[PDB]
Amino acid sequence: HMSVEIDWDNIRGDLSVNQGVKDFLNSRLQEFELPSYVNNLKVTNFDLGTMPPNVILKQMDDPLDEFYSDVQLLVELDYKGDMSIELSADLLPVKLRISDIGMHCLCLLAYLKKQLFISFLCDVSDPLLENDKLQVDPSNFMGKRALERISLIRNIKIHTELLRSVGKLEEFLVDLFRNLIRKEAAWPSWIDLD
């Protein structure tokens, strides 16, 4: 494969992208039943890592019909890096730190009318790829079989700051972010950006 190297820090440092996934997060975040004991749970900061992911272009296509309202890249995507998501809530106000967000997955990127959609399709080590049981060639493509799809986030860490009932809370935010990006950023849904 011929690799093409692109500056990471100017992507990482994109005002347009950061304010966008923050918005995306906050937006979809507000669409969840949280427990009685949590309030004003807002995203305060996003940061794509200082570590660039390795990308493999698997396909170029015209953007799928389903951007009903330029270019589409089917892309294997390996993020074993230092992406960090910063947060805040009340209960007592706190500050949360989501880190070490692992990732290895097939992922549609579709740019058109100055928009960029990011749909995570599925994990590269999903067993439903075993016998083309999920059709991930967008030409059959991504059937109902999609429902049985192992989660796209591979690693994730979290720290908090102002016995250890924070555990119960830290299991919760993880089993929330996780459930969000399935619900809202993985196909049929996607992250929208300008």
Domain ranges of the chain: 1-194
Beta bridge partners, 160, equal: 96
CB neighbour class for 77 (10 Å; exposed up to 12, middle 13-18, buried from 19): buried
| Nearest residue to 72 via CA among 61, 85, 87 | 61
Element (H, E) at 90: strand 84-90
Q: Which residues contact 30 (CB under 8 A, 6 or more apart)?
A: none
State this model's resolution in angstroms. Answer: 3.3
**How was this entry determined?**
X-ray
| Cα–Cα distance, 150 to 2 (Å, whole number) | 31
| Cα–Cα distance, 45 to 57 (Å, whole number) | 29
> What does the block give as tokens for 122?
């599925």
